[PDB]
A paper describes a structure:
In this study, we investigate the structure and biochemical functions of two SAPLIPs from human (Necator americanus) and dog hookworm (Ancylostoma caninum), Na-SLP-1 and Ac-SLP-1. The structure of both hookworm SAPLIPs were determined in hexagonal space groups, and closely resemble the fold of the Sap domain, as known from saposins and other SAPLIPs. The fold is comprised of a four- or five-helix bundle, where a kink in the third helix can lead to occurrence of two helices, α3 and α4. Three conserved dithioether bonds link helix α1 with the C-terminal end, helices α1 and α5, and helices α2 and α3.
Na-SLP-1, in contrast, is exclusively monomeric (MALS 12970 g/mol; theoretical M = 13530 g/mol). In the crystal structure of Na-SLP-1, the C-terminal extension of about 30 amino acids, which is attached to the N-terminal Sap domain could not be resolved, which agrees with the results from mass spectrometry. The crystal structure contained two molecules in the asymmetric unit, giving rise to a complex network of molecules in the crystal packing with a variety of different protein-protein contacts. The two monomers in the asymmetric unit agree very well in their overall fold as is reflected by the Cα rms deviation of 0.55 Å. The crystal structure of Na-SLP-1 reveals the presence of seven exposed basic residues on helices α2 and α3, giving rise to an extensive basic patch even on one monomer which is likely to initiate contact with the membrane surface, driven by electrostatic interactions. Crystal packing analysis of Na-SLP-1 reveals a P2-symmetric dimer, albeit with a moderate interface area (571 Å2). Despite being a monomeric protein in solution, this dimer may possess a functional importance in the membrane-bound state, since it combines the basic surface clusters of the two monomers into one large patch. For Na-SLP-1, we found 14 void volumes with values larger than 5 Å3, the largest ones being 29 Å3, 30 Å3 and 43 Å3, using the same probe radius as in the granulysin study. Intriguingly, Na-SLP-1 and granulysin share the feature of a loosely packed protein core, as evident from void volumes in the interior of both proteins. The function of Na-SLP-1, in contrast, may be similar to granulysin since both seem to share a scissor-like motion of the two “jaws”.
Residue numbers in the entry: 1 to 88
């Protein structure tokens, strides 16, 4: 994966799962079951995605449930996006 792809993928994944719950996220355990499912939709990204959500599910949960949600921002904090890259 390019650093671009890797950034884009972070965003696509978090946005898709956030849209899935329509912003009403029930619990971290549940959030995680979907983050994992969503990781497996991407052949080349599965392995990295899965470890990313594992380590950072608390940060993703917090940011998602605050109402802010901007995917590109949480991906910057995880350093899967750098200030260089762009949103979607």
């Amino acid at each position: 994966l390019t650093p671009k792809e890797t950034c884009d993928l972070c965003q696509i994944a978090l946005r898709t799962v956030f849209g899935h719950f329509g912003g009403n996220i029930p619990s971290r355990r549940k959030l995680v079951h979907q983050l994992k499912h969503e990781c497996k939709r991407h052949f080349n990204y599965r392995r990295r995605c899965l470890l990313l959500m594992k380590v950072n599910s608390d940060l993703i949960f917090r940011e998602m449930t605050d109402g802010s949600f901007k995917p590109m921002e949480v991906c910057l904090i995880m350093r899967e996006c750098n200030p260089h890259d762009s949103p979607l």
